[PDB]
Design a binder for these strands. Sequence first.
DNA 1: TCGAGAATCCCGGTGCCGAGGCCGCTCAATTGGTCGTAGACAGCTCTAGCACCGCTTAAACGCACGTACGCGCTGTCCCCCGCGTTTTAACCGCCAAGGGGATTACTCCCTAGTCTCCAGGCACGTGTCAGATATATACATCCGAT
DNA 2: ATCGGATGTATATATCTGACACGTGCCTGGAGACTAGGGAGTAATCCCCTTGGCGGTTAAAACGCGGGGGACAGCGCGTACGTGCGTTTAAGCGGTGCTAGAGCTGTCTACGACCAATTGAGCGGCCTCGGCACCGGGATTCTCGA
Lengths: 80, 81, 106, 97, 94, 93, 80, 103, 53
Amino acid sequence: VLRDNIQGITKPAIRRLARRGGVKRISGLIYEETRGVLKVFLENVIRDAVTYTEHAKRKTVTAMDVVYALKRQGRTLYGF
Amino acid sequence: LRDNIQGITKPAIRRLARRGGVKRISGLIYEETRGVLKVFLENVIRDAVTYTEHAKRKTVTAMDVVYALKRQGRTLYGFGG
Amino acid sequence: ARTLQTARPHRYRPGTVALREIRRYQKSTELLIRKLPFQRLVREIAQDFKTDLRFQSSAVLALQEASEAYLVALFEDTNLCAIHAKRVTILPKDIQLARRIRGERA
Amino acid sequence: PHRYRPGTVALREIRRYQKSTELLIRKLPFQRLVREIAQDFKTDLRFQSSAVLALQEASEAYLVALFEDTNLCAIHAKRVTILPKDIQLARRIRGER
Amino acid sequence: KTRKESYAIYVYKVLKQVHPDTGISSKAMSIMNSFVNDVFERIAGEASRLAHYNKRSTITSREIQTAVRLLLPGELAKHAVSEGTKAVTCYTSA
Amino acid sequence: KTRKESYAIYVYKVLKQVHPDTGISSKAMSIMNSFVNDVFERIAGEASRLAHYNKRSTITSREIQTAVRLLLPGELAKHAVSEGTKAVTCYTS
Amino acid sequence: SYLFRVDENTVIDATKKGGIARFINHCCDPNCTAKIIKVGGRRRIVIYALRDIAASEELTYDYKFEPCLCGAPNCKGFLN
Amino acid sequence: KTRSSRAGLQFPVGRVHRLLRKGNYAERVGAGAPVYLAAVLEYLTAEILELAGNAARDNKKTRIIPRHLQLAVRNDEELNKLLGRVTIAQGGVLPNIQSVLLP
Amino acid sequence: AGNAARDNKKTRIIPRHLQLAVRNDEELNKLLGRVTIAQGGVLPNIQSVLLPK
DNA sequence: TCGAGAATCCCGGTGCCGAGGCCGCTCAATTGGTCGTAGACAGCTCTAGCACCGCTTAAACGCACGTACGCGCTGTCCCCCGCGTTTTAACCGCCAAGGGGATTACTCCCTAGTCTCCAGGCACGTGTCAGATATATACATCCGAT
DNA sequence: ATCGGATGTATATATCTGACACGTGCCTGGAGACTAGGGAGTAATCCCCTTGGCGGTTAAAACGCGGGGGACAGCGCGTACGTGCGTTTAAGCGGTGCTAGAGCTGTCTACGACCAATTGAGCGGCCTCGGCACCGGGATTCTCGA
Ligand SMILES: C[S@@+](CC[C@H](N)C(=O)[O-])C[C@H]1O[C@@H](n2cnc3c(N)ncnc32)[C@H](O)[C@@H]1O
Ligand SMILES: [Zn+2]
């Protein structure tokens, strides 16, 4: 099993994401907050992805399952 | 029927804002709010009138408004939905 | 020991009548806009789409309901923005920020 | 000797990153994270290759977008830094909480 | 006159078994009716979409279960699926 | 092997009219295919609901017109309804 | 005394028969109140939570009887 | 004589008629519904490919990549509303910096 | 809704009681996060920065 | 710190209208039986997701310094609130009319459905040039001293 | 503001592949033709309910004013954030191996659509009284100035 892998989202990665979004001076407590937010988003999407997989009696999470999970939440995605 | 938006007077906006939970209104809100409300009303009545003239009739029913609302994400319970 | 029971001029400072109107409106459930002005406003806006419609009397009412449940909700959000900026008043630059973040302007 | 003024490398990085389209988060640790979050819903999960990336792509367009809003909230308070009480407002206004 | 239909009498039969003495108003009855219609449409539409991705040609008692488990939140899902499967068992063995 | 149909060739035929010497990559063609699918599903769903409301069963060229007027924004609606009526006219003769 | 006054000409007596609601003590500061609902057309005594109550907390309640082992920070020496 | 050529189109009116029939939309698909729908789809894909090619040209390239579709859509004002919630993959962000930040 | 209408000393479920029953829950609130219940009013709530000191 | 006065809740008395039960009367749900086919299932093929290994090298971490911005405080001034007086039109009740929304009655024409016939679009190779590096160099921006 | 330089970025030439664009078979989805049938278009008509107008009244809006609380500007303190440099570390890339499980095909049958006769559930119209809105008069709380 795996555990405490959320720490792989490093400080420079969040920093670069903020820089793309337009930020210029990131606080210090942000990294933990965005790690929590990203974890929540990922949980909510993978729940529906796994439900869509289970329904079809499969054991591989297809790409169309992730696309449908995202579409079902009002966040469509072009390219898969 | 010209210049009726002044019918959404100041006390009505005050009461809406009180129910919203705000405590100390500014003085310029009472025009931004009329603009917002006019935009919302145009966006809804456009689809209501589309729904009502697609069915070849000249009377905006309540089902037309319910559909025009449900279509923009904002449903509405109570009027025959 | 005894049987227990359940029963046996002026000028308010600014900011108190507001905190009372808030409590008396957040518990009532009627419509907060006059009905004839909203009637006329709906009829006047629907001119730009088709000339002579008849607006069945439950349509108008319907709109009014939504038109409240939108504005009220909007104000809630704007309130937070004000409280976020370390103030108490709500300003037009708060409504615009709420509508931008929320997706209505982009 | 020489030292760029504090904060002037920020805008250079801003322009450098807003112009490209690469993926900002490292791919393998993100694969591990997504692969272990789904351990709470099943166990013999396989995660077809183009699915993970899919997720990752979406999971960037979220965060970036969120920061685009966080900044606004910061700028609303006559500020520059984005303190963690901005993300919370930016997530409560759009109904995500 | 033309006879239109609703869920009035069934909502009333449920109210008269959850609160055997309360009584619903009229506007509240119309609200509950439109609520039932809205949830019906949500669930049946998601069930259809789901019975389409899989290329099945029918909308069975399992598309409905997965739809209920997607749309309904965390804990309402478990109780909803329990009531559903109980009803389906009690119905098939009769 | 396995036959899967897509809107690649039609998107290419249209590209060769709007820009006779450019060429779409693979990812961009996948994106355009997904875009066409999305818009088709939106318009079809809205026309379906719009036929269900008036208690009909034929989904004719009036429902598609009204659905284009509902979905597409201000200006795109006008040009889209114009192209549509022009094509149905040039087809019914 | 475990007597309780429903109205002017009727009282509840829980000295020998009743619920565990006979195990709620009088406190100068209460966190629960007692209202009189009417279900089925008859009056009954219900106990509502006045203020939020945490776990493993004693349920205080004001008797209004009209000595006091109150033990409250602010408190009066009489149940009467 | 395919039913698309008879209308002066490039989209497959036959395939769109088939999809409308086999998608469980209504009981009886009309006659001039697939023509209308194919014409609308063709107009939209042309309107987006034109700006995509324009954007790809100014950047001195002859191949359209997702960056150029992102630019073409988000720069427009009525396509940005149509595709208001999509996230074009490998698309990136439109360059913009708040005025308060730059010195 | 009946619990609310009883704890409010009435005996008729009424739109305000449905609005209360929904918005006071936590999961019935996500199922109906977008709806608006006509004649349901709003839930009593005042921020803490506003309450006097 | 406590009086007072303004607002709020709670207890009876009263009228009225809509929530609920009752009666006839449909028409749609029930039951039985047939029949075609959607899908279950056993089985086989093959691809692609998983795991490991070795190098290298770019990205991550720790550390130091210094300085820009958060922030807490103080101080004006100004404008939004609470309240009283005057003015308006919303609202309620009522009457009259006629448009058009439903409903009914015919009829016909537009589409499903089936069979026949074949050409267009999709998997599969093959070719080459468009774009990605890579290097050298010129020009732009930025920072210290004055 | 002025240079001087130092770092970074943009410009242009060389070259190097791999992914796009084109030509080929070939398989089945699309086009033609014809029929039957029911869904939609059209005429009659009727009565609901929308529109329009009018008088009273009184609730709510409009206006003006006094002032106290709040928004906004201006400074010092200090810390926590950015920038640069020298380390570590594990990401990435390439190459191998392999086995799980997606995917596709043929056989069989259990299940849902379809159709006929019917009959009782529920839907519309009629009362009707009890719950609720309204009014009035107590107690009971809260705010504010002293
Ligand atoms: C409902 S009984 C409380 C139950 C009691 N603790 C028991 O063990 O049964 C209330 C009675 O308990 C006693 N009591 C309750 N609260 C008290 C208090 N605060 N001080 C003194 N006696 C108290 C009095 O005799 C009072 O009449
Ligand atoms: Zn005591």
